[PDB]
Amino acid sequence: SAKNYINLAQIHASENSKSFEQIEVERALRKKYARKDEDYDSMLGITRETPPELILPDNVLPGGKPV
Amino acid sequence: MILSVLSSLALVSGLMVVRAKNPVHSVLFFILVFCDTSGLLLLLGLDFFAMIFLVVYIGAIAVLFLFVVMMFHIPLLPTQRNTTSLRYTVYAGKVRSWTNLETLGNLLYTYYFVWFLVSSLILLVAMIGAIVLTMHRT
Known part of the structure; x- marks a missing residue:
């Protein structure tokens, strides 16, 4: 627990310190990619991947789910 | 007698369409149904429709069906003794006579x-x- 909360605190540090201009982009990206549609995306030939800013580090996952 | 045999063959092909064993032969008889139908229309005097039936039915619809099947696997009594000579032809209107297309x-x-x-x-x-x-x- 002591070791895990150390890497848990990094996301809170990188989140509470975000600037307002970054927060606008973050909220826009979060709302834009809230839900997906395989049908229309496949029809257009494109795949909508989550942006890198919207990826939590694997060390705070329930035990590691990179996929 | 040309009408009778053609109609009978068309009827047989149509019957075999619905009781076919495999879809390929069903489509093959489906094509023959329209072939006979176009011949019948040709006998009727409408050459344009008789050939549109080739162009559309067995030209595009039959090809489409075959493509899909390939993958994803009071009358007048017959007495006519004195009627073939009682035909009155009005020559007016034969001059400048249009076709089925115009x-x-x-x-x-x-x-x-x-x-x-x-x-x-x-x-x-x-x-x-x-x-x-x-x-x-x-």
């Missing part, structure tokens, strides 16, 4: 032109529907 095109695009545009809209619906459903594009 007559049809005279009034298809000019008087009844709304229905023509409705058929165009039907074709557009078909074209759009064939795309929205089947574009996987993976």
Whole structure:
């Protein structure tokens, strides 16, 4: 627990310190990619991947789910 | 007698269409049904429709069906002793006699032109529907 909360605190540090201009982009990206549609995306030939800013580090996952 | 044998063969092909063993032979008999039907229309005197039946039915619809099947696997009594000589022919109207095509095109695009545009809209619906459903594009 002591070791895990150390890497848990990094996301809170990188989140509470975000600037307002970054927060606008973050909220826009979060709302834009809230839900997906395989049908229309496949029809257009494109795949909508989550942006890198919207990826939590694997060390705070329930035990590691990179996929 | 040409009508009787042609109609009988068309009827047999149509019957075998619905009781076929495999879809390929079903489509093959489906083509023969329209072949006989076009011949029958040709006997009727409408050459234009008789050949549109080749162009559309066994030209595009039959090809489409075959493509899909390939993958994804009071009367007058017959007494005519004194009627073949009682034919009165009005020669007026034989001069400048139009065909089945000129007559049809005279009034298809000019008087009844709304229905023509409705058929165009039907074709557009078909074209759009064939795309929205089947574009996987993976």
